[PDB]
Amino acid sequence: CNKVRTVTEIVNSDEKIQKTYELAEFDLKNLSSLESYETLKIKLALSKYMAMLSTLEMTQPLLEIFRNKADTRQIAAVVFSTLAFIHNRFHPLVTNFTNKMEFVVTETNDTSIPGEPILFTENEGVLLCSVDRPSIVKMLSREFDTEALVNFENDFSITEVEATQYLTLLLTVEHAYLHYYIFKNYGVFEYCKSLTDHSLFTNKLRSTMSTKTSNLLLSKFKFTIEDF
């Protein structure tokens, strides 16, 4: 029912209070509280990531680091740290990785996988991390809009055009980690098939013993393309 009626049963009388209430106000307060908590969680995650990257002991700005093709050591370090962070987010008990990862940076179209930048592979029992630095630079350097356009519809030197890039790195590494988890939990054939679909994430990623609950940095907002 739209509204709820409360009547007080007074002993040995007839006069009564018959007060009617709505559920709309309670729903609004519930939604507001939930949105505030989700926003706080997202900001806490971003702060953790930024603090970790800061602890990496790197002198240069992040985008500058990703522009320096001459040295790949820093890029490998950053990618490794972000992957470890995602692993910690899913499974807080375990932090490090059992195996060793060899990192390769690629700077040509031929290496560029058409769309999935952080290609995650393994050969002879050793994980390999392939990276398309030019694609990373292109995404990080698209002049992110800063003007206040909500469009929701239905001391420190950290500008919005920087927090945005940090979040974008988080999202890209997140997609990479999902593909890697699919690879690990099943056969190589499953990983290859999923690469061309992205439609097999529904295996067990829901709230389960093996896959714990998490915001995953992408359920915070529903989104979609507006093509016909």
Partner: peptide
């Protein structure tokens, strides 16, 4: 605010109803 779904008209209603029922006879 706790974001839980309480007993719509059971827990509070059972509180009032038990209180009043024992208030009678």
């Amino acid at each position: 605010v706790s974001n839980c779904k309480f007993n719509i008209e059971d827990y509070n209603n059972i509180f009032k109803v038990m209180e009043n029922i024992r208030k009678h006879s």
